[PDB]
Amino acid sequence: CKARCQAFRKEVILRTIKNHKDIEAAKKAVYTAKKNAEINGDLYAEADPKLIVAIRIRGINGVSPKIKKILKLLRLRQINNAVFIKANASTIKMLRLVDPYVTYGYPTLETVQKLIYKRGALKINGNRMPITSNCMIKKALGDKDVVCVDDLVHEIYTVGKHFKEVNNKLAPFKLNGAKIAEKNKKIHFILGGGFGNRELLINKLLANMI
Amino acid sequence: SKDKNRSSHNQSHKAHRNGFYKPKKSAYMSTKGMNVQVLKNTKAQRKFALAKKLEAKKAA
Amino acid sequence: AIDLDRHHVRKHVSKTARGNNAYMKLLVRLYGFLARRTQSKFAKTILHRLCLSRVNRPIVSTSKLACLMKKHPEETAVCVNTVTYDSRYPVPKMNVCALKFTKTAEAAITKAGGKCLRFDELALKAPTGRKTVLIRGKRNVREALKHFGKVCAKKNPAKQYKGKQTK
Amino acid sequence: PLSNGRNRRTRKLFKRPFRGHGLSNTSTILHTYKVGDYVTILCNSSIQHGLPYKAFHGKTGRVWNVNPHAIGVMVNKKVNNRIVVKRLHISPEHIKPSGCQKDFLERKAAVAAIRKQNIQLKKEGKPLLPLPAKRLPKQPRPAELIKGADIKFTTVAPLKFEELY
Amino acid sequence: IKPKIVKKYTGHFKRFDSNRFLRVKASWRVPRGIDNRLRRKFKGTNLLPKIGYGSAKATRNMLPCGLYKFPVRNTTDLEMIMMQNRKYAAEISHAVSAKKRQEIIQRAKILNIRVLNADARIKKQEVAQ
RNA sequence: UGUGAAUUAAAAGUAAAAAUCCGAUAAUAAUGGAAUGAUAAAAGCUAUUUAAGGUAAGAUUAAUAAAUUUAAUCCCGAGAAUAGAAACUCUUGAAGAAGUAAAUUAUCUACCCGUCUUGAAACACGGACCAAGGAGUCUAACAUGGAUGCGAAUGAGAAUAGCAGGAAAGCUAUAACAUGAAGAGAAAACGAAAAACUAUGAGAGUGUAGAAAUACAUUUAGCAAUAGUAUCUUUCAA
RNA sequence: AUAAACAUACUUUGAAUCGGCCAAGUCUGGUAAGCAGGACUGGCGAUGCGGGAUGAACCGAACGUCGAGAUAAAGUGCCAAA
RNA sequence: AAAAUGAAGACAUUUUAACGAGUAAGGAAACGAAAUGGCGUAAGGACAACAAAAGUAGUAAAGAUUUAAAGUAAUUUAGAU
C-alpha cells in the first residue's frame, strides 16, 4: 500500500544532500579563488549575478501602454508582487524601461528559501494552490525532474536547465508593505529613492516585506 | 458656433482593444491575376493527374 | 487592485440540453455520466453536440449516410440530429443512430434491412464508441448565410433582402 | 493642412541620393526574382512610369508572381483596426533584394552541414556531432582572474573645472 | 444546539431624501440621478445595499429562537413539519379564527411542534379571570 | 625640558571574553500579549535498539598553517522497529444575561434634489404641502435569434362544407393557393456530375512505460469548416 | 528571451456616441490670456477614498461587508493621530 | 472557471482558486448542474384537510394605525387597536 511513501521520503533526502552539495561546493570554489588571487597579487572578477527578483512598487493607474505590456510579460500585475527573472541582455533592458514602477536586485539563498517556503504557490489546473506537500510538487513538475520543494529552491537559485518551466509554474508572490525608501518612491534608489536596481540591498527590503 | 475640427486623441487606444486583425493564411494563397502561362501549365497538369486518378478509380 | 487583460465572464459553451424536453435532458444526464466516468473522447463529443441549438444541429439525409458508409459496411452511423429521406436515390442497408428519424426515412432504412437506433440503444451497445462513424450535416447551406454582409462589397457581396421594388 | 495629391510631400522622399543620379546599376535588371523571395519596395523617382505609391517605400514584401516585365510583390497594409493584403506589380527598377533572412540562412547551412556528417558518422558507427547551440541574449560573464604582472592602474577622480573661454 | 447568527448591518437602508420629504417614502430606491450625492458614494453618504451585506447561508432566514418559519392554516398543515420539529416552527396565519387556533395549538403540543403565535387572538381572560 | 601623529624591539598572545564606536545584519529562539479560531489523535514530541550522517563548526590529539588542509578515536546520532501520556476551573443572568429598537447627549462625519452641460451646492431652470391619475401601446410587412412540430416538403383556423351539444369554444374535411424543392438573362431563347480531386482537421483501436492519474509509438477513419481546384447551367460578361 | 487554454479565431444581431475638457522637461497664430488650434500619452467626463486648509483634472491609490497588521503620498509646537 | 456527485436532499448541490468601482447602454421567459436571480398590482385557468364534507372567514374578511421579526434590497410575516 503506502510503502512508497518511505521510498518517496528517502529519495527527497538523497536529492537534498545532492542539492546542498552543489550550492556549498560552488560557494567554496569562489572563496579559494579569492584567497589564491590575493596570495599571487592577481585580480579576481566575481561572476555576474544570474537571478533577479523584482517587486512592483507603483499601482495600476496612469501607466504608459508600452510599460503596461512589459509589466504583464513579467507577471508584475499588482502592487507588492515579487517574481524571479533570468538575467540577460534581453531582460535587463526591459527592467530599465519599467524602472519607475519596479525595484529589483540580486537575492541571496535565504531570501529564495523564505519566499518559497512562506509565500510560495503553484498554478495547477488554473488554480493558485499554495505549496502544502511534495506530492503536489511531484505532480506539478514531475516531468521537469523537480519532486521536492528543496529541488524547487535549488533550481531557482542556481538557474538550472528547467528554470523557465519551473519559474512559470510558480505564481508571483504577494508581499506585505514595508518602508520603501528614504525620501520617497518618486526617485531612483541611487538618489535615496525607492525604485531601480538595489543590487544586494533588495534582501533588506524583502526581509521586512516577506 | 465654431467647433473643434479633428483629433487623433484616443484613436490608438480604441484601435488596440480588439487589436489589429491579421489576415488568415488563405489571404496569401490567392492566385487571381497570376502569370497566364504559369496558370496554363498548372491547369494542364491538374487535369492530367485528375483524369488518371479517376480512370484508376473506375478500374477498381 | 490588479491589472488584468479582461474580467471573468460566462464561458460561451452550453453544458446542458436546451429547453424543457424531458427526454433530451435524460440523454444529457446519461452521457454526462458516461463522459465523466469512462473518460472517453467519444462520449465527450456526443455530450457536446447534444447541447447545441437546433440551428447548429443540421440534418443529414439518407444519401449522405449511404455515401459516407459505403466503405464502412459493418459500422453504425452516429449523427446527433434529424435524419431526413432523399427520395431521389436508393437507401442501402445500414444501422443508423440519430435523435430523430423522419417517417419516410425510417421506413426506407427498415425496408432495406437496416436498423434505426436511438441514442440510448447505442449507449447500451457501443457506449465508448467502437463501431461508430461520427457524422454531422452541413451548416453553410442555410439560406440566411446568403444575406449576411454588405451587398455593395467588391469581393463577396451579400444577397440583398428583397422588398419594395426589388428588380 | 496638405493637399491630397498622389505624390504629396516628396521633396526629400523622392530625391535621388547625393551623387547618385542618372542611370541605375545593371544588376537591378539582371537580378533573378523567384516566387517566395523577400524584396524591398524602393520607389525610383528617376523612372516615373509605374512608380509605386509612396506609402510602400521601405516596406519589405514577398514575391508572389513573376511577369515578363514586372515582379509581383505582396506586402501588408494597416487599416482602421485591421491589416489587409496588398498585391502589387512592380518593375525591377523599384524593388531590391531583401537581406532580412541573411542571418537565418547562415544557421540553416551550418545545421545542414552538421546533419550531412551525422549520416556519415552513424553509417560508420562513430558517435554523431551535435547541432550548433541556439542563440541567446548576452549572458552574465563568468568569473575571471586577471594576472598581476601586466596590469597598470589609472586613478579616477572628479576633474577640476576649467573655463572654456 | 444553535449556531451564532451574525448580521453584518442591523440598521435599515432608508431611501435618500426620505427624511426631508413626506412624499418620498422610506422604501429603498437606488438613486439614478446624474448628480446624486449618494450614488457617487460621497463621504458621509455612501450607504447602499450590496450583496456583501448578505448574512451567512447557514444562518439565513433563521428566527432568533433558532428555527425557521412554517405558516399553518389548519391541523393538517402541522403534519408536514412533524418530522422536522427541531428545524421548523408553526406560525398560524393572521386570518385564522380563535376557534381554529385552539385546535392547532392543542395538536401542535401533541406533535411537539413550537408555535410562535401561542398567545394570539386569546380570549378576554386577562382581567377578572 | 615636556607632549607627541607614525614607526621600531622585547614580554604576552592559537589570536572566539565583556563594553562602546564603526561595519554587518534582521531573523532561529525565549518571555509577555492582540485579532480570528480548534480540542482530538498525531508524518506530534519522549524513552529503548542498529547506524546514513556531523563538508570551517560536535570534541580532542597528531603532521603543519595567513587552511571551509589530511588523518586517528571518541561522542551525538536522522530512517526504521519497539513502548509513551490531554480531558479543566471561576464569575454573572426571569431581582432581566447577550443582543436589538426608540429618545437624548458626546467625538467624528454630512452643501439641493431632477435635468441640459467640458463642468452645478450654484447668483442656471422646475419644485409651498398631501392624496389619487400619469407617459414605449396596438395593428400590419420584413429580418435575426432562443424553445416547438413536421421535413422535399410545411401550412391549408383561404374562403367554405359538415359533426356531436344547445357551443363566437373543440373536431373533421386528398384542397385553390402561399413559401420551398433550380438557376441565370433586359428579352427571345435556355436550364446543372469527371456517381468529383487536394490540404488540414473530429472519432476508434493496439503496444510499452511511469506507475495513481497520465504520457510516448503504431494502424485506421476521414464528418463540420476554410481555402484551392477539374467539370456543368445561364449571361456580352461569373 | 519573455508571456499566453476561462488562450486563440471569431460569427450574427443590436444599443449608446461622434458639443468634449485638463496636464505636460511639446508645437503653431497671437503682446498675452482660465485665448484659438494640433502630435504622443495619461486622466476628468463615467470616480469615490488618503494628502495638498478649501478645488473635475495635481500626488498616492481606483471601491463586495468586516477584524487585525505592516505601508503610500505626505506629515510629527496646538487645532491634529504622530 | 474547473473537478466531484446527482431523481429530489436543499440553501439554486460539494470542494478549490481567482475575481467584485462606474454615466450612456446591454443582459425577455424557459433550459439539474440551469445562456443573471428576484419583489410587487390586478384579472383568467387550475392546485390548496387525500378515509365521503378537502384553503381562510360573524370564535371576525378586506382596509386603516402602530409594535416586533425575516430578507443585502425590492418587500414579506405576525401581535395589538
Automatic annotation (TrEMBL), chain A:
Annotated Large ribosomal subunit protein uL30-like ferredoxin-like fold domain residues: 55-102
Record-given protein name: 60S ribosomal protein L7, putative
Record keywords: Ribonucleoprotein, Ribosomal protein
A GO BP annotation: maturation of LSU-rRNA from tricistronic rRNA transcript (SSU-rRNA, 5.8S rRNA, LSU-rRNA)
Source species of the chain: Entamoeba histolytica (strain ATCC 30459 / HM-1:IMSS / ABRM)
Gene3D superfamilies per the UniProt record, alphabetical: Ribosomal protein L30, ferredoxin-like fold domain (3.30.1390.20)
One CC-aspect GO term: cytosolic large ribosomal subunit
Family to which the UniProt record says this protein belongs: Belongs to the universal ribosomal protein uL30 family.
Molecular function GO terms recorded: RNA binding; structural constituent of ribosome
Keyword Membrane part of the UniProt annotation: no
Membrane in keyword set: no
From TrEMBL, chain B:
GO CC terms: cytosolic large ribosomal subunit
Highest taxon of the lineage: Eukaryota
Presence of the UniProt keyword Isomerase in the record: no
Composition skew (Basic residues), residue ranges: 11-24
Pfam families, A to Z: Ribosomal_L29e
Gene Ontology BP term (one): cytoplasmic translation
Keyword terms: Ribonucleoprotein, Ribosomal protein
Region (Disordered): 1-24
A GO MF term: structural constituent of ribosome
Similarity annotation: Belongs to the eukaryotic ribosomal protein eL29 family.
Protein name, UniProt field: 60S ribosomal protein L29
UniProtKB/TrEMBL annotation, chain C:
Protein name from the UniProt record: 60S ribosomal protein L18, putative
SUPFAM superfamilies: Ribosomal proteins L15p and L18e
Family: Belongs to the eukaryotic ribosomal protein eL18 family.
Tree of life domain: Eukaryota
Molecular function terms from GO: RNA binding; structural constituent of ribosome
Signal sequence interval, chain numbering: none
Alphabetized UniProt keyword annotations: Ribonucleoprotein, Ribosomal protein
GO BP of this protein: translation
Location of the Large ribosomal subunit protein uL15/eL18 domain: 2-163
A GO cellular component entry from the record: cytosolic large ribosomal subunit
TrEMBL record, chain E:
GO biological process: translation
GO cellular component term, pick one: cytosolic large ribosomal subunit
Matching SUPFAM superfamilies: Ribosomal protein L32e (SSF52042)
Listed PANTHER family: 60S RIBOSOMAL PROTEIN L32 AND DNA-DIRECTED RNA POLYMERASE II, SUBUNIT N, RIBOSOMAL PROTEIN L32
One Pfam family, short name: Ribosomal_L32e
GO MF assignments: structural constituent of ribosome
Keywords: Ribonucleoprotein, Ribosomal protein
Protein family (similarity comment): Belongs to the eukaryotic ribosomal protein eL32 family.
Top-level taxonomy: Eukaryota, Amoebozoa, Evosea, Archamoebae, Mastigamoebida
Protein name in UniProt: 60S ribosomal protein L32, putative
CDD domains: Ribosomal_L32_L32e (cd00513)
